[PDB]
Design a protein around this ligand. Sequence first.
Ligand SMILES: CC(=O)N[C@H]1[C@H]([C@H](O)[C@H](O)CO)O[C@@](O[C@@H]2[C@@H](O)[C@H](O)O[C@H](CO)[C@@H]2O)(C(=O)O)C[C@@H]1O
Ligand SMILES: [Ca+2]
Ligand SMILES: [Ca+2]
Ligand SMILES: [Ca+2]
Length: 194
Amino acid sequence: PNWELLSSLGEYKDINLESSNASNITYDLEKYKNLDEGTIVVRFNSKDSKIQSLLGISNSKTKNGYFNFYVTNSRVGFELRNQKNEGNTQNGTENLVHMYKDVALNDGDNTVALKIEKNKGYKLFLNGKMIKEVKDTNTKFLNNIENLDSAFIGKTNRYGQSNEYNFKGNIGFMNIYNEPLGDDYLLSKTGETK
Ligand SMILES: CC(=O)N[C@H]1[C@H]([C@H](O)[C@H](O)CO)O[C@@](O[C@@H]2[C@@H](O)[C@H](O)O[C@H](CO)[C@@H]2O)(C(=O)O)C[C@@H]1O
Ligand SMILES: [Ca+2]
Ligand SMILES: [Ca+2]
Ligand SMILES: [Ca+2]
């Protein structure tokens, strides 16, 4: 059974992205880069409609080796991609997971969670609802991307002129956990901005 109380692996607060100056958390990369499962919970308030990274963990030497937990004004999701060749090329790209849900967002604060349970599947939660489940008996996550070297709150650091999905607005908090938390907890917690 689930821990009633589990400390976060990563905890970040009050991230001002009103100028899209993304917050560099590569100092914590070691704690995430080999994760096969976990939970990410984010309270956020965007001011744009474009695809924007809540959390971007990447091999900045490639265009397409990254994890991008993102939102728009009408969608939340994540992509997980790997790339075997560095620099200015599309070569060696493996598009591993794209999971998303079209959904109504609040004008102000919203709260989203991504839960990954190793070899069970992935769940997205938003504003007190479990909005999308993808079952998967052979899951992939950060451990599957080669040569990760950057983590940011508010963008994904990619090679050259790639789209970094710069978030504009503020992120009130981000908690990352090494384990998949209970649906009950995530329904209540994301439910704070119902
Ligand atoms: C979440 C998502 O859809 N991500 C896409 C990304 C975005 O659709 C786009 O950057 C938002 O503007 O598009 C990616 O593929 C790009 C192609 O759409 C474009 O034709 O060519 C680009 C290369 O110069 C790029 O390959 C991307 O930015 O990598 C694919 C990604 O999953
Ligand atoms: Ca907003
Ligand atoms: Ca799979
Ligand atoms: Ca870059």
